[PDB]
Chains A and B, each alone.
With several copies, the nearest count.
Chain A
Amino acid sequence: SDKRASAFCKEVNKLVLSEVVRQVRVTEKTYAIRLDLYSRDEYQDEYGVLQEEIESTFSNRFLKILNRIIKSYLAKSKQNCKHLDFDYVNGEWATVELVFPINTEKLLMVSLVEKACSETVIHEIPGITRCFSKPDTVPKVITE
């Protein structure tokens, strides 16, 4: 079905964590961030990947990547993951609480989280992306 076709499309499709995040604020002090996500059914229209999958992927992989980018900018400026709080029931905000030595130089955390979420993938068949459907009444899928 067209429903089944669109489903299968979304399945083979890849998507990045940034494609779901709304505006994000990071709170300074303690070093705490809270992300906004889009509403679950509006989340499952353009998608249909699941909430617990968001939890799993966000937590592990996004924390890893964020730590990578933080450490690397720390290495350039030279010249730990403390707390996680996801909206486990409603799935509509993602707080992460980080703690840092006070001696370090400031951080453009805004650009950092944006770079992070724009980098981590939720699910991607390796080396494929952008599956679409384009019409002779011949149901076909056209994938880059």
Chain B
Amino acid sequence: SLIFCSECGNLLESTTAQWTTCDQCQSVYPSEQFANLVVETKSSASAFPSALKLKHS
């Protein structure tokens, strides 16, 4: 769910700043194509020591 260039591999900088261009390949790309980058992050299991978790096991 990331933004790599295709000429260079340069992990490009965020487009919410401006138009996207790799710092080395200087390749131009339409910034709006990959707008709305969603990363839904979830806490891993066995992450909160409960006083009821054993009642859940």
> A contacts B directly in the complex (CB < 8 Å)?
yes
Question: Chain A interface (Cβ within 8 Å of chain B)?
Answer: 18-19, 21-29, 38, 42, 46, 102, 109-110, 113-114
**Helix, strand, loop or mixed for chain A's interface?**
mixed
Closest A residue to B47 using CB positions: A114
Contact flag A27-B40 (CB < 8 Å), given A19-B50, A46-B52, A102-B16: yes
> What is the interface size of chain B, counting residues whose CB is below 8 A from a CB of the partner?
18
The 10 closest A-B pairs by CB, nearest first: A28-B39, A102-B14, A46-B51, A24-B43, A23-B43, A26-B41, A25-B42, A21-B48, A102-B16, A110-B43
**Helix, strand, loop or mixed for chain B's interface?**
loop
Nearest Cβ in chain B — how far from A33, in angstroms? 9
B42: chain A residues at CB < 8 Å are 23, 25, 110
Q: Is B17 an interface residue (CB 8 A)?
A: yes
A109: chain B residues at CB < 8 Å are 41
Cβ-defined contact, B43 with A114, below 8 A: yes
Contact flag A18-B48 (CB < 8 Å), given A26-B41, A102-B16: yes
Cβ-defined contact, B47 with A23, below 8 A: yes
> B41, B45, B49 — which one has the most chain A CB atoms within 10 A of its CB?
B41
Nearest Cβ in chain B — how far from A44, in angstroms? 12
Q: Is B28 an interface residue (CB 8 A)?
A: no
Contact flag A110-B38 (CB < 8 Å), given A102-B16, A102-B17: no
1/0 contact string of B11-54 vs chain A (CB within 8 Å): 00010110000000000000000000111111111011111100
Contact flag A110-B40 (CB < 8 Å), given A42-B52, A102-B14: no
